[PDB]
């Protein structure tokens, strides 16, 4: 069985090709002791107070290879419990990943881990695959990074890719700002954890942000309560939707960027005119920070306001969307048609890391 490892900004999703879900999901982090000897994922939480905690793909591009190899070694030996030499491994990459980067990934797999074969796929591309389409425009918001990726006949159009350096860690931080400004105590990593859960449980995307601010101002009907373990109930009403409102208004955390509805629209307007009609009717959302209730509906209404009046627009938001990158990999990795596309160890010895292009 082939392996599928999605190298996410905050979490690794990995498992086997042919499966409907990943087997292992864990923070994309390496911890080394200071004293005196390596832990990854859940464990670099599970022994956190004696380590230096590294984040080798904070931002989505892999920044340190040592720590990255560590993440892979953990993923192969602890988490999937596999011999990497027995399995094809499909690896994911961020949109706009530097070629020296993709070659490096390839070098590590073959050289270090000794895989019989491998392949690098773009994350957003896989998510579009998971939604059974080969043309569409993907919004992928995950932990550390958001992109808009328009895709034609199976191939990202890298010149139209848009990037927003704001994603769900930035939203947790902001809920954390909000709540701490209200008098509450959230600093510790046991306490970010709480803020995250509050965000993941209660936050939603307003259909109309001012229409929603006024409902919160006039009745108590949007006020929800959350019990910290220390007994404290924290009541929130407008914060629920101010937090994810930042994807659309990046000014909320002091950023000068276009919001996601806008980057979606600019990205379409950088593609071929003759394929715009099909991006518009095939906007797919993916990644954990797309999970807010109302985001598809808001995205519909905003694009509508931007597009020409006659344009058929469709937003698609799979309930799997936290994991469609990975599912897309699992699908593609398992298809008969894909099997002549794997980069084989023979192919690597003969062509070098350059082959992966």
């Amino acid at each position: 069985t082939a392996l599928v490892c999605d190298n996410g900004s905050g979490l690794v999703k990995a498992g086997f090709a042919g499966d409907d879900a990943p087997r292992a999901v864990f923070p994309s982090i390496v911890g080394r002791p200071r004293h005196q000897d390596s832990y990854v994922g859940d464990e670099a939480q599970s022994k956190r107070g004696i380590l230096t905690l590294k984040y080798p793909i904070e931002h989505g591009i892999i920044t340190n290879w040592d720590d990255m190899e560590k993440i892979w070694h953990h993923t192969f030996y602890n988490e999937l419990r596999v011999a990497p030499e027995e399995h094809p491994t499909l690896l994911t990459e961020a949109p706009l990943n530097p070629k020296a980067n993709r070659e490096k990934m390839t070098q590590i797999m073959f050289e270090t881990f000794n895989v019989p074969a491998m392949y690098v796929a773009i994350q957003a591309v896989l998510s579009l695959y998971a939604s059974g389409r080969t043309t569409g425009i993907v919004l992928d918001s995950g932990d550390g990074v958001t992109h808009n990726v328009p895709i034609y006949e199976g191939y990202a159009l890298p010149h139209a890719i848009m990037r927003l350096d704001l994603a769900g860690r930035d939203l947790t931080d902001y809920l954390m700002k909000i709540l701490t400004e209200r008098g509450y105590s959230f600093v510790t990593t046991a306490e970010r954890e709480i803020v995250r859960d509050i965000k993941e449980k209660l936050c939603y995307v307003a259909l109309d942000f001012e229409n929603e601010m006024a409902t919160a101002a006039s009745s108590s009907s949007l006020e929800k309560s959350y019990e910290l373990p220390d007994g404290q109930v924290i009541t929130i009403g407008n914060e629920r939707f101010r937090c994810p409102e930042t994807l659309f208004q990046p000014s909320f955390i002091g950023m000068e960027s276009a919001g996601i509805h806008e980057t979606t629209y600019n990205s379409i307007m950088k593609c071929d005119i003759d394929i715009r009609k099909d991006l518009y009717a095939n906007n797919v959302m993916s990644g954990g920070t797309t999970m807010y209730p109302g985001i598809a509906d808001r995205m519909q209404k905003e694009i509508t306001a931007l597009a020409p009046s006659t344009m058929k627009i469709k937003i698609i938001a799979p309930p799997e969307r936290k994991y469609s990158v990975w599912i897309g990999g699992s699908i593609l990795a398992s298809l008969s048609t894909f099997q002549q596309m794997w980069i084989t160890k023979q192919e690597y010895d003969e062509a070098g890391p350059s082959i992966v292009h």
């Binding site: 059974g132 080969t134 599912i327 593609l332 008969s336 894909f338 596309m341």
Partner: peptide, 21 residues
Amino acid sequence: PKVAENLKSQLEGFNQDKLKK
């Protein structure tokens, strides 16, 4: 020159059901 259509067809047509649980 030949590297899409059969792959295209399995992807679009793939039954997400047929996936191990």
